[PDB]
Each structure stands twice: as C-alpha cells, then as structure tokens.
Amino acid sequence: ALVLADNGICCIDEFDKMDESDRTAIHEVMEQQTISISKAGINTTLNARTSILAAANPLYGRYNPRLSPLDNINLPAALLSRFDILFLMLDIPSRDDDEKLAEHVTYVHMHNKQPDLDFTPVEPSKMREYIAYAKTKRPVMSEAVNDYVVQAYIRLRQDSKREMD
Amino acid sequence: EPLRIIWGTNVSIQECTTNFRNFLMSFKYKFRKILDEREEFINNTTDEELYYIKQLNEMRELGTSNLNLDARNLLAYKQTEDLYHQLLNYPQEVISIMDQTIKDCMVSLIVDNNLDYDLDEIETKFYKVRPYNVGSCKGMRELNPNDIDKLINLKGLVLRSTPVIPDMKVAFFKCNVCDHTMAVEIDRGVIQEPARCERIDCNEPNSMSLIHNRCSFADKQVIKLQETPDFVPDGQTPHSISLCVYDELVDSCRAGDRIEVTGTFRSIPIRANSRQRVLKSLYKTYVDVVHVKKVITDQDLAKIREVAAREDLYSLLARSIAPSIYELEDVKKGILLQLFGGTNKTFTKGGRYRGDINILLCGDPSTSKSQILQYVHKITPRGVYTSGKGSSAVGLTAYITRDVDTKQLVLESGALVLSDGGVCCIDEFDKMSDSTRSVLHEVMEQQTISIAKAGIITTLNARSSILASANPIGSRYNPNLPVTENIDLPPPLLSRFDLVYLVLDKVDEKNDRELAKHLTNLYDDVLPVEFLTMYISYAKEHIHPIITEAAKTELVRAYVGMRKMGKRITATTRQLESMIRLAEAHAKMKLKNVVELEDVQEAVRLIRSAIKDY
DNA sequence: AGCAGATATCACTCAGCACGA
DNA sequence: TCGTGCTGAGTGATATCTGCTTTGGGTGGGTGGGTGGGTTGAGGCAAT
Numbered sequence: 001a002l003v004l005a006d007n008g009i010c011c012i013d014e015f016d017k018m019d020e021s022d023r024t025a026i027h028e029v030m031e032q033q034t035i036s037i038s039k040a041g042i043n044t045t046l047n048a049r050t051s052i053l054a055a056a057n058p059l060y061g062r063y064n065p066r067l068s069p070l071d072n073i074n075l076p077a078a079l080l081s082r083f084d085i086l087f088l089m090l091d092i093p094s095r096d097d098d099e100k101l102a103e104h105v106t107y108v109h110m111h112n113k114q115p116d117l118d119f120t121p122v123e124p125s126k127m128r129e130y131i132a133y134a135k136t137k138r139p140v141m142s143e144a145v146n147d148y149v150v151q152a153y154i155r156l157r158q159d160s161k162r163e164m165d
Numbered sequence: 166e167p168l169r170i171i172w173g174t175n176v177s178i179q180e181c182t183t184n185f186r187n188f189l190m191s192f193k194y195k196f197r198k199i200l201d202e203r204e205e206f207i208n209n210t211t212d213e214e215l216y217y218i219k220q221l222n223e224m225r226e227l228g229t230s231n232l233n234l235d236a237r238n239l240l241a242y243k244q245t246e247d248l249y250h251q252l253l254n255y256p257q258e259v260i261s262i263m264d265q266t267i268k269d270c271m272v273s274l275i276v277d278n279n280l281d282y283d284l285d286e287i288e289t290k291f292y293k294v295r296p297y298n299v300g301s302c303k304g305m306r307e308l309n310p311n312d313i314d315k316l317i318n319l320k321g322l323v324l325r326s327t328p329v330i331p332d333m334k335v336a337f338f339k340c341n342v343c344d345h346t347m348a349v350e351i352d353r354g355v356i357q358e359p360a361r362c363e364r365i366d367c368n369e370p371n372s373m374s375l376i377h378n379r380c381s382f383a384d385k386q387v388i389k390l391q392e393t394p395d396f397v398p399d400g401q402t403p404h405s406i407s408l409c410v411y412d413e414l415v416d417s418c419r420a421g422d423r424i425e426v427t428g429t430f431r432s433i434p435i436r437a438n439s440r441q442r443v444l445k446s447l448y449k450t451y452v453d454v455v456h457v458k459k460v461i462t463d464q465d466l467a468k469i470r471e472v473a474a475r476e477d478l479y480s481l482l483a484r485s486i487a488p489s490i491y492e493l494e495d496v497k498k499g500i501l502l503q504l505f506g507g508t509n510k511t512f513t514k515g516g517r518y519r520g521d522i523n524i525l526l527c528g529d530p531s532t533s534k535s536q537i538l539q540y541v542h543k544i545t546p547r548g549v550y551t552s553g554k555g556s557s558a559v560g561l562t563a564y565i566t567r568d569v570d571t572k573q574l575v576l577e578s579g580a581l582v583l584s585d586g587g588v589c590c591i592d593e594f595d596k597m598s599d600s601t602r603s604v605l606h607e608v609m610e611q612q613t614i615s616i617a618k619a620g621i622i623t624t625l626n627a628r629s630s631i632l633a634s635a636n637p638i639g640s641r642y643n644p645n646l647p648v649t650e651n652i653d654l655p656p657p658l659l660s661r662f663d664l665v666y667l668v669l670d671k672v673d674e675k676n677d678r679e680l681a682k683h684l685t686n687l688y689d690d691v692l693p694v695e696f697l698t699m700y701i702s703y704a705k706e707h708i709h710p711i712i713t714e715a716a717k718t719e720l721v722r723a724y725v726g727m728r729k730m731g732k733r734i735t736a737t738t739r740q741l742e743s744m745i746r747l748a749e750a751h752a753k754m755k756l757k758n759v760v761e762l763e764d765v766q767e768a769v770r771l772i773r774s775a776i777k778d779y
Numbered sequence: 780a781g782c783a784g785a786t787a788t789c790a791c792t793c794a795g796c797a798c799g800a
Numbered sequence: 801t802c803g804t805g806c807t808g809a810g811t812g813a814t815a816t817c818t819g820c821t822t823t824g825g826g827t828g829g830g831t832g833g834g835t836g837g838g839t840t841g842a843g844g845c846a847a848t
C-alpha cells in the first residue's frame with residue numbers, strides 16, 4: 001500500500017499494533033524515502049517520497065498521567081523524534097463538553113445532517129483544487145526571517161532542555 | 166535480367182545497395198550540422214572530413230566489426246532519405262543489405278588503397294550495423310499491432326537476464342556408411358537434412374546423422390525490461406517487455422541498469438502443446454534488439470601528485486569528505502584515515518596482520534551520524550550500506566538460498582563479504598541478532614566467514630573495514646554512566662574498534678546558534694567526490710608505507726607513556742596496533758612510502774582524544 | 780483431430796532380344 | 801552399330817490405411833518423479 005502512497009500522504013490506522021517488519025519499512029520510508037526489494041524472484045527499487053499519518057493508542061490503552069509521555073508510547077523514541085508534529089488527544093470529562101458532544105451526535109443521528117448552522121462548510125471540490133494550487137506554488141524566505149527562526153530555535157532549545165531536566 | 170525486389174514492396178535492392186555505398190563513401194558531419202540548424206558551429210577540419218570512411222579505417226585498425234550508425238545522418242544526406250524511411254518500415258532486409266554493403270566497402274578500401282593488410286582475415290569476418298536514434302521513444306503501453314515488424318526505440322530498467330543460450334547457425338551431418346561429412350545451412354530454424362548421401366559412389370538413402378558438438382552456434386539471451394517510473398500514468402504496476410540480444414550485445418547490460426534499446430517489434434506464434442503443430446490465436450510480442458545504450462591517465466597522475474604536494478592536504482581532504490557536516494573535524498580526520506587504511510602484512514612464520522581501521526560513531530541521536538555513513542559510502546570505492554536487524558538489506562553473513570528463477574541451490578555472499586577491501590557501513594549497530602553479533606566478532610577477529618551448512622564447507626574472505634553507528638538506550642546519552650552502559654553493547658565487541666567517537670549534543674548557546682546559522686544558510690576549497698574517490702583508489706592500490714627507526718622509537722615511547730599514566734590500566738597492546746595502523750594510514754594519505762615522526766605524532770593524538778572520551 | 784508406423788498396389792529403370800540398316 | 805517396340809521382373813516410391821494419446825486432474829496411479837506443473841491450511845516439531 002506504500003507504493004500507492006508514493007508522493008502522497010499515507011493513512012495508517014492502528015499504528016502501534018503494526019508488526020516490527022512494517023515498522024522497519026516505514027523507517028526506511030522516512031529516513032531514506034526509498035522502497036527496496038531484495039529477492040531472488042525480482043530486485044526492484046522504487047522511490048517513495050510519501051508522508052505518513054499515524055494513529056496509535058497508549059501502552060495501557062489509555063494515557064496514564066502518572067507515567068511519563070515516553071513510557072505511555074510503545075514506539076521507539078527515534079521514530080517519535082523523526083515525526084515533525086505529534087498531536088496528543090485526550091478525553092477529559094466535563095459537563096459542558098459532554099452535553100455539546102451528545103447534542104451533536106443525537107442531531108446527526110436524527111436529521112442525517114450537520115447540526116451546526118452558524119457557518120456554511122466550503123465545498124470539497126473548491127478545497128481540493130485550492131490545495132492543488134497551493135502545492136503547485138513555491139515560496140521563498142529571506143535572511144531576516146532566517147535570523148528570526150534561529151532566535152526562535154535557540155529559545156526553544158533552552159526551554160526544551162529546561163523541561164527535559 | 167533477374168531483378169531482386171523486397172517482398173511486398175517495389176523497392177529495388179540494387180538501388181538501396183548503391184545508395185548506401187554512396188552515402189558511406191562520401192559523407193561529412195557538416196551535413197548533419199546544417200540539418201540540425203547548427204550550421205554556425207561548423208569548424209573547418211572535423212566537419213569537412215569524411216566521417217564513416219574514418220570510422221571504417223579505425224575499425225580495420227582495431228580489428229572490430231560492428232559499426233554504429235546514426236539514423237539522422239541518413240536524413241542529413243539527400244540520397245538516403247528514402248533509405249531511412251525504408252529502414253524505419255522494412256528493417257530486416259535493409260539491415261542485411263547494410264551489412265553486406267559494409268563488408269563490400271571494407272574490402273574495397275583495401276583493394277583500392279593496395280594496403281599491406283591481409284585480405285583473407287577480412288574475408289572471413291562477419292560485419293554488422295547498429296542503428297540508433299530512429300525517432301521519439303514510445304511507451305510499452307503504446308505498442309499496437311500496427312507497429313509489428315517495424316523499428317522502435319524503448320527506454321526502461323533491466324530486471325533480469327537469462328544465461329547465454331546457444332543458437333544454431335550451421336548443421337553438421339555425417340554419413341553412417343562412408344564417413345562423409347557435409348554442412349547444411351539453417352533457414353527459419355529448419356534443418357535441411359539431406360535425403361541421401363551427396364556422394365555418387367555412396368548413394369545410401371536415409372543414413373545421415375547430426376553431430377551436435379561439431380555444429381556452429383550463436384549467442385542468445387532474453388532480457389526483461391520495465392518501463393521507466395515517469396511512464397506510469399497513475400501508479401499501477403509498471404508493464405514489462407521481453408528483449409532478445411544476439412552476439413556482441415549479449416552481456417551488454419546487467420540487472421538494475423537503465424538502458425535504451427533499438428530493435429524490431431516482432432510477434433511469434435506459441436504452440437498449444439508440445440505434440441502438435443497447433444498454434445494459439447494470441448501472439449506474443451518481443452523486441453529484436455540491434456543497439457543498446459546505457460543512460461587513470463598521465464594527466465590524472467600529475468594532478469594527484471600536485472594535490473599531494475600541497476601543504477594543507479590533510480585539512481583539504483577532511484573538508485572535502487563532509488562539506489555539509491559542521492564542526493566535526495576529528496571525526497572527519499578519523500574517517501579519512503580509515504578510508505585510506507593501513508598496510509596489509511602477509512607474514513611467513515607470523516600469520517596475517519590486518520591493516521584495516523574500525524570506527525564506532527556513537528552519541529546523541531540529534532547529531533548527524535547517518536549522513537556521515539552515506540558520505541563514506543559515496544566516497545569509498547567498495548562498500549555496502551546495512552542496518553542491523555534489517556530485512557531490506559541483503560544481510561551481513563553468507564547464507565545458502567534457493568534460486569526461485571531457476572529452482573537451483575546458490576551460495577549467496579553477505580554484505581561483509583561483498584565489502585572485501587572496502588568500508589562496510591552499518592547504520593544501526595544497537596539492534597542486532599546474536600548470530601549477527603557472533604558473525605561480526607568472527608569477521609573482526611579472523612577476517613573470514615566460515616559456513617558449514619547445506620553440505621557445503623567453505624570459507625569466504627571478508628577483509629573489510631567497519632564503520633558502525635550506535636545510539637543510547639534512552640532519549641540521550643548520560644555522561645555520568647560509562648560509555649559501555651550507554652551504548653548497550655558487549656564490552657568485548659566494543660573493545661575491538663580502533664577509534665571510538667562520542668559525538669554528544671550538549672546544550673550550549675554558542676554551539677546551538679552556530680548550528681542554526683549553518684543549517685539556515687544551507688537553504689577553503691573543496692574537492693569533487695569523483696576525484697577524491699580516484700585519489701583514494703590510487704593511494705590504496707600503489708603506495709605501501711614502511712615503519713622506520715624514528716617511528717619505532719616514537720611509538721615505543723608513546724606507548725610507554727600512555728601505560729605509565731595509570732591499579733587502572735590506561736592502555737593495552739591493542740592501543741599500540743591501532744596507533745601503528747593509524748600512522749601507516751596517515752603515511753598513505755601523503756603518498757609516502759616511509760612512516761615518519763609526524764605520522765606517529767598525529768596517530769598518538771587521534772588515539773588519545775578517543776581514549777579521553779573513554 | 781492429429782501424428783507416426785505400416786501395408787500393398789502403383790510405376791519406372793536397366794535389361795536384352797528380333798528385324799534392317 | 802541406331803531405332804523401335806515387345807518382355808520383364810526387379811527395384812523401387814509414393815499414394816494410401818491402422819492404432820495411439822493427448823488435456824491436465826485424481827472418473828490413469830505412488831514399483832513414472834518432486835528440479836514438468838498444482839499449493840493454500842492445518843498440523844507437529846525443533847530451536848528459540
């Protein structure tokens with residue numbers, strides 16, 4: 001399925017349950033962006049500059065605040081580091097949020113349509129063609145923004161070292 | 166008079182022969198230049214001189230027979246535009262005519278020039294023509310029946326090539342009654358066996374036997390070709406086409422090589438079964454290839470010597486090795502010394518002393534360590550890239566497998582064996598099988614791999630250096646604990662590396678700022694990679710340094726001093742062999758045949774810095 | 780249905796003689 | 801020693817009839833082989 005995802009995002013579900021062989025395959029996909037086959041039958045190497053979307057569950061099934069974030073994550077720390085952005089989503093009980101969620105789900109079940117009426121969703125076709133246009137586009141950066149990014153990097157490095165203490 | 170015509174057309178063979186002879190006899194590249202709208206690039210010597218006459222003369226001088234023809238040159242000449250169109254439409258007959266005409270002109274050159282070259286040798290040769298550049302290249306998916314028996318161009322990647330297949334040319338028959346022999350030619354693969362003995366006196370019918378080993382054969386090979394990645398419209402499985410190559414073109418392209426092939430699109434019936442003349446409706450398509458293309462000198466030695474004479478050669482090589490890596494001078498120097506390597510000693514009475522150098526790259530994951538391995542691979546003339554516990558890689562040890570293609574037992578050599586005489590880079594040393602660790606220990610101890618499985622008892626040479634990388638157990642390397650605990654490797658295996666480098670990403674404002682500046686700018690001369698590889702190859706092939714008395718004294722004094730530092734043992738005898746190897750490698754780098762005090766001083770310093778980390 | 784082995788009935792070559800030239 | 805039949809049985813030859821067997825799959829077997837194909841699923845075993 002990775003080949004079909006070449007030059008495109010990969011939608012992987014149950015990421016933690018994946019076997020170690022596929023873990024090594026995705027590791028090769030990320031670090032090298034290449035797919036290599038070494039078999040007697042055939043030997044073909046196909047380039048794979050494909051992004052990955054991963055969904056996983058904690059080690060215990062649910063996140064444990066007592067344990068450190070690394071402990072809750074079964075995957076190797078190197079794989080987590082290689083990920084550009086990691087989003088942690090949790091379900092915290094609350095009267096207001098639960099009530100709104102229940103109302104939304106009930107309305108969806110009854111009327112078979114989006115309950116929200118404050119705003120009208122944009123047409124999917126427009127969104128996808130806009131995304132294609134943006135992909136076709138090429139930006140550029142200056143030296144001042146480079147210096148700003150350098151300053152942000154040193155600040156973030158100091159903050160992250162202090163946090164990792 | 167008998168008038169010879171190509172079947173199904175109205176083209177006279179005599180006209181084609183005379184046109185091709187005239188084209189070959191008189192043709193200049195200036196015609197091609199004017200045709201290509203490059204008339205203003207015309208010079209006065211090469212473009213005004215006969216081209217194919219010179220080609221034929223050079224071919225006679227070198228003794229070769231095959232001639233490469235550019236089809237566009239036919240269009241560049243007024244007479245042969247019809248010949249070019251015919252070649253595009255009727256390739257087989259035109260090619261045969263071209264071959265015969267080439268032989269005719271080759272003999273006529275000697276006849277007219279009354280040269281001293283032997284004619285009998287020429288008369289007994291076979292000549293061929295290999296046209297190329299016959300138009301835009303089509304795709305494997307655009308080949309319709311209309312293109313059958315026509316000349317096509319196809320670009321793709323080679324996937325496999327069968328062994329050489331003997332193809333019959335002339336059949337040799339023997340009489341069972343009179344011991345009389347006769348050779349009968351083969352047409353369309355049909356042997357024209359005589360009905361009876363050709364001898365008047367011996368007219369014995371039906372007594373002719375075919376002697377298989379006394380017949381004339383040719384070379385044939387079948388190759389599978391896959392369309393290039395850009396030809397795939399959506400991303401489905403790329404299609405493939407079968408190619409056939411005969412004679413010189415055999416073994417002209419290995420697996421995994423991207424090639425461009427010119428040939429004839431042919432269709433052949435397939436028999437339903439082996440018992441009968443019955444044929445399948447559907448025909449199989451393939452390409453009869455006629456041309457295949459793949460897509461140290463005195464001056465080089467002078468340049469190498471000039472570079473060696475440069476004072477700042479060490480720094481220049483260190484910079485050229487890793488231009489994109491910032492502030493790792495010591496690691497780059499160690500890598501350079503490993504690449505050049507030490508002197509291999511073949512001792513009588515002593516055995517074998519290895520001249521290789523092993524370096525371990527361990528430290529924090531943030532720092533650049535895999536890029537260094539990739540650079541080393543790009544530089545080393547011989548080597549393989551591998552990661553421990555990696556299915557994609559071929560493997561680190563030799564193994565016995567089954568050839569799926571052929572259903573045959575084959576002994577396949579591992580990555581370490583294939584790296585004999587080079588540098589083997591192992592990306593992920595931390596995670597590795599026990600078996601693989603034992604194989605690595607054996608390779609780094611005995612330098613040979615032994616396998617006694619599948620009824621095979623053999624030993625394979627593995628005289629290769631190792632440049633491995635490692636990561637700590639946790640998210641970072643803890644300075645408080647010793648290196649052995651952090652790297653998570655056996656003390657024995659960790660004590661065999663000559664140089665151990667601990668590149669640590671300590672949080673320092675200055676270092677972080679400089680690294681950020683370097684990285685953002687990525688968005689002292691440097692040597693090209695090719696020249697560096699050539700220099701390394703020449704140094705490893707020719708120069709062999711030898712230790713001198715001053716080097717002996719310096720080495721002894723340095724070892725004694727290092728031992729006296731520490732009861733704690735600061736250094737062992739291994740730290741002396743490592744110094745000897747490093748000094749020999751440094752002497753190799755300067756293209757010196759004698760190890761001097763400077764090399765020993767450099768060696769003690771590189772060895773000491775790693776020990777200080779330890 | 781196609782293929783390989785076999786039977787038997789189909790001609791053709793060298794054989795040679797009578798007449799006469 | 802040429803020409804023209806008549807005789808002729810021998811030496812062919814070619815136009816002409818009599819019996820397999822096959823595909824592939826257990827409606828030929830395991831004293832035809834497993835390197836001529838089939839062949840994915842369950843089961844037991846040793847190294848791990």
Ligand SMILES: Nc1ncnc2c1ncn2[C@@H]1O[C@H](COP(=O)(O)OP(=O)(O)OP(=O)(O)O)[C@@H](O)[C@H]1O
Pocket residue numbers: 078081489490491492493529530531532533534535536537636683684
């Ligand atoms: N001195 C340096 N100069 C340039 N880039 C550097 C340097 N040190 C670190 N980097 C950057 O650090 C990153 C390290 O990537 P690399 O592939 O080498 O990681 P690695 O050592 O294999 O990591 P891991 O142990 O997590 O697998 C690269 O982006 C490299 O640009």
Ligand SMILES: [Mg+2]
Pocket residue numbers: 534535592634
């Ligand atoms: Mg790495």
Ligand SMILES: [Zn+2]
Pocket residue numbers: 340341342343344345362363364367368369
């Ligand atoms: Zn004979």
